[PDB]
């Protein structure tokens, strides 16, 4: 039986704690939401057996087999996990960049964390500090409109390439543009009240982030209903060439789209949320399924080509990674079929983008072949983190 | 041992006919003509039995390649079923008859050919595959793979830009090597020096090597009447001269007829395939083995053919289909799909923005089909069927 | 003695009858209830023959003009024949019967009437010169004079550009003062500190100087369609308000409900003339007498009416007619012909630019008739001709 | 009789000398064309008298009576002349600017010519020295064309509003730019050679200046063809586009705008060229037709519009008078129905005109009310050259 031949593989008695380590090793983390009954048994108890054993680990059988028999999308995940660490310290040096001078706090705070497709976590640095989405919410509604309306309809409001403001067809370029992203605010949830739209996003990113960190800064939506002239001008602008959909409250929208860029996450439950992004939209620390696989197409594909601002393109040439950076200073990052990322460090460079965090993405697909048009056959001195020796 | 261990599997009692042996090839997808399998093809038609030894005599050769074909170990495994399917979208396309043809061309709109050649050597043609036409635009992506080979990513973008669209970007530099401009640029970085007749030898050169050495020719009837009317590429021509936007000592004019001279160049549906494989490949032409070209060079290529490789009609075809592709005047286009396999479509009538319109079309649907597009997931794709897959 | 002079040159024996001195002045083109006129008119109420002396008295008050009138010295002399001229063009432009009405005005698809008050006062209309409309973007030459001439150019021009065409020019100011957004910073800029109601109050004042007097009024039914369909222009207010382009502690929703009633302000096509005719003339009102404008701040409201005073289609307008104008929504075009006269078209169906179709046809057409071209000559005008001279 | 009547106003027997000096004051030239007759007669004799005096003066006496009846349009031109002379010393001062460096002389020329619109003429500095027309001839062989083809058939191919090359129908923006002048080119005289055609120009050019100094710089004509890769390929983006009438030799064409371009003048000479556009398209000098009103009020139009490159806005807003620079140096100058002038300069600024020259061009309206929207009789603090006192 599985939990037999998993118990030689973990013996030759077994000590309580000595199971433990070992499970860390494969990426797993502790508290994962799948290994919930089987660290209730655990919890129910200091020196196993084959009896007392199977007993705890019967219920999450499948997925502790495959952790420990490698099977892990990055079977050496200490090795990769050391890397990472390399790529943080690299990136801890460079000091340049200016903070959203409308953010106040610290230049000195900077993290990263990798949620693979398969449950593996890492973080270093200060990944357990919540900072706002801004931009980098984006994607995330964009997403939850394409899956409750779909495609056809969704593209209806907005369009899907880069660049002013309207298109050929008068609507705004695509939704990662403010123009767009308020456009795709404006299909959410339609008929109820904004408090409750709201109250079903983040029930939608709480899905998406398996239930980590989501929470929200009340200081950063004052700030930003304060400071919205532009984005008023824009709201009227739309409202005028007829954007919107129809029985739409225009300045109701606007207050709406503040309250989205105020959500707070953190470095390690974003991750979380990229990595749904990465798995086909099933969300990869409790295996439930959160988006259409149409929402995760239509998003990475418009995350590649306009997610980094005017930086975009320099960006899809060197990086090939669909990302979503945001002026709180985080970098959503999606390396499809294998993990998603959050990077986070305040002090941003002339185009409003995480100077660290653009250093890191960079010294990231430089070293393995996650570049979306690298070989996985032939790919010179890059390593393969998904492969064994 | 492993010829005993595959004679075991195709014999079912002790001796194997040649033409059931040479019958289970092919259905993998193999063509019999395959370079690599050279060796046992002789060594079989040197001989009609074939016993554990008089086998093992014409196969432990290419032993390695002849195994993970018949253990079904190739990257679309049930390649008989894949291949049904490129036919139906085939004659789902054929009946599209939209769209004008190039008037410069004087081509059946009832032409129509596909062509796939995966990273393994699976061969599958259905419709016109072996008439010959002209690259045209597709050559482009080809000669700046071919630039960036011989000279590194640094150098060749010091004279060409590398991204989508006056003519000349911020920086002075033609806006990708995709465009015109930009392709006339490239064009004058390839083999500086020796005289044009040699930088184009040498050109063919490496399109056979690209091509698995199947069809590379070449159109004079083409290449006159492109330097009858290149009256915008002569245009293009002095205001690079004029931006400073060549290399020391290029001769202009001369350089606009090494590229008119390399939109002329000719190909099969088959040969581009192969071609278009070797892209998909990280470099190595699939069927013959070879290192072709640097996968930095390969990345590149790929890169740009995703971003402005369909003319006005990236964007759209990004984002709906996902794959990098360019397509071509003379009705031509090349598709790669990365780590899988190479295509290549042609039929002559185009659409307003310049497009093959049955390619784009067959383009679209092969999307809508397999999970094949970019940003496709290999684990939940929905309702899209996955030909790298058995059940 | 001047009084005697004329006398004599209107008296045929010793005494002259009242109505034959009103007939001969009617016909120099002035109107009887000339403001320059007014004593005379009074003394003759007053009282049917004058002779050398009762006549004397009732002159002398008003006698250089009423000289300068007799003796033929006016700007266009032969005031009678111009007049018939004005007509023919009248009738020509009545035939042409395109176009269509703003939808937002509910007024005769076949009203239409010009309006003309030369540089002294000579006055003439026909048509529908009588009925009230909205100034609307006419409005904007206005209140750019009027804020020139309170704070001017130097000031004026730090906050606007002087210029033809996102919005925002280079130096992120507004184009020009004749495009809406430079028309809302300008009108930021008057009567600063005070409130609404009294800018407002302000501005009226000072169109009834440069009306002469003559109707100036206001259309609350205007104003209220006008703030009700007010996105596109609060649009503009939240950039402005964003790229910090007005003067300090401006409040932008007010300014824009101030520039909503300034295009609500009503005239005639009879006072709008004579407005006009105050910028033909240098600043002076022309039936007053009175300084209503700093001849720099005409100079400039001039120099961008011949610019970017007719929407898209001020460069057409300009090469062919070379006269200052600005149009509005109403169905008005403002005419000056500098030196010469004002004028004022009324014709509510607008051409695909947003200009009165008829108005259009007659700015033309004046122009192929008389030698008003800013780039015509005086002395050599080849079969034009020229209504400043006798024969 | 008028000689009688004028043989009082100038004497009270005449000394010769002493009548000559009379009419230099009239702003004339002893050369004037227009007195040849008369100066023929006194060359054929020192002490006119009545018989005498009327012998000489008959031929030429409409003319000699308007000029000292001060009935020019410029009656007090000793005057006006001077403050011409302080405007000179004035701009003199500024010393900005960069020579065209491909133009290889002196930094320190600098000279202006008044012709009046009556043949009253000024100069001061290097007037009489030679100087390339280079675009300075864009407005002249566009007056050439319209003159000979009309308005209507010449804007069949080019346009005539400011701005990439081509307009909305695919027409060069106007004449006063490259493409349009280069297009013009290909309308003048069609059929003959280019040698012909460019005869033929000369001959037109030479009525324009009253026969004084036009020739022909070699020199310039082939730094021209040299760096003319710009050019070409404005040609060449011409012949594609099919902005050419049929028939016509493009390459052949290209050569013929390049000699146009290596036309010499002087400040002297263009002043007078300039003046017959200020005076409806007859010669002031010569009295002589040349241009069809037609063609002089097209000309005048656009030079408003685009006739110092970039700057063309800032002009005609401070300046209100229809000019054109040209690289060698030039400002030809027109104020409508009064004179015209030639400036020249050879350092340039940033965008192409002669600093000296557009120094000139503002002080000469912020003094007089010669700026098109001046009102001629309420004016402020200007003065009115044209007025007696």
């Not at 801890?92 to 990263?112: E, H, I, N, R, T």
């Not at 299909?187 to 996003?201: H, R, T």
């Not at 953190?266 to 992004?277: D, G």
């Not at 988006?291 to 393109?313: I, K, Q």
């Amino acid at each position: 039986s599985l939990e037999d031949l998993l118990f030689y593989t973990i013996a030759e008695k077994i000590p309580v704690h000595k199971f433990i380590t070992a499970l860390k090793s494969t990426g797993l983390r502790t508290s994962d939401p799948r290994l919930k009954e089987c660290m209730d048994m655990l919890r129910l108890t200091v020196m196993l057996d084959k009896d007392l054993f199977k007993k705890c680990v019967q219920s999450n059988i499948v997925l502790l087999t495959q952790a420990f028999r490698r099977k892990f999308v990055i079977p050496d995940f200490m090795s990769f996990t050391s890397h990472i660490d390399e790529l943080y310290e690299s990136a801890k040096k460079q000091s340049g960049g200016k903070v959203a001078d409308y953010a106040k706090f610290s230049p000195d705070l900077w993290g990263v964390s990798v949620c693979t497709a398969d449950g593996q976590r890492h973080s270093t640095g200060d990944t357990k500090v919540p900072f706002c989405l801004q931009s980098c919410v984006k994607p995330l509604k964009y997403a939850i409109a394409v899956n409750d309306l779909g495609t056809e309809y969704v593209h209806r409001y907005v369009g899907k390439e880069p660049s002013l403001f309207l298109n050929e067809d008068d609507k705004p370029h695509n939704p990662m543009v403010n123009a767009g992203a308020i456009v795709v605010t404006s299909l959410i949830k339609q008929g109820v009240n904004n408090a409750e739209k709201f109250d079903y996003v983040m029930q939608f990113l709480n899905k998406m982030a398996g239930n980590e960190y989501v929470g929200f800064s009340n200081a950063t939506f004052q700030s930003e209903r304060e400071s919205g002239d532009r984005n008023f001008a824009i709201g009227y602008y739309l409202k005028e060439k007829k954007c919107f959909p129809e029985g739409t409250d225009m300045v109701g929208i606007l207050d709406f789209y503040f309250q989205l860029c105020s959500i707070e996450v953190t470095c390690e439950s974003a991750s979380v949320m990229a990595a749904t992004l990465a798995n086909g939209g099933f969300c990869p620390i409790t295996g439930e399924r959160v988006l259409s696989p149409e929402a995760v197409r239509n998003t990475l594909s418009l995350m590649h080509s306009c997610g980094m601002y005017d930086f975009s393109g320099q960006f899809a040439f060197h990086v090939g990674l669909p990302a979503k950076s945001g002026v709180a200073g985080g970098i959503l990052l999606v390396v499809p079929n294998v993990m998603g990322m959050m990077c986070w460090s305040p002090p941003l460079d002339k185009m409003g983008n995480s100077v660290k965090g653009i250093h890191f993405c960079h010294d990231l697909v430089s070293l393995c072949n996650f570049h979306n048009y690298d070989n996985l056959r032939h790919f010179a001195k890059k390593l393969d983190p998904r492969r064994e020796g």
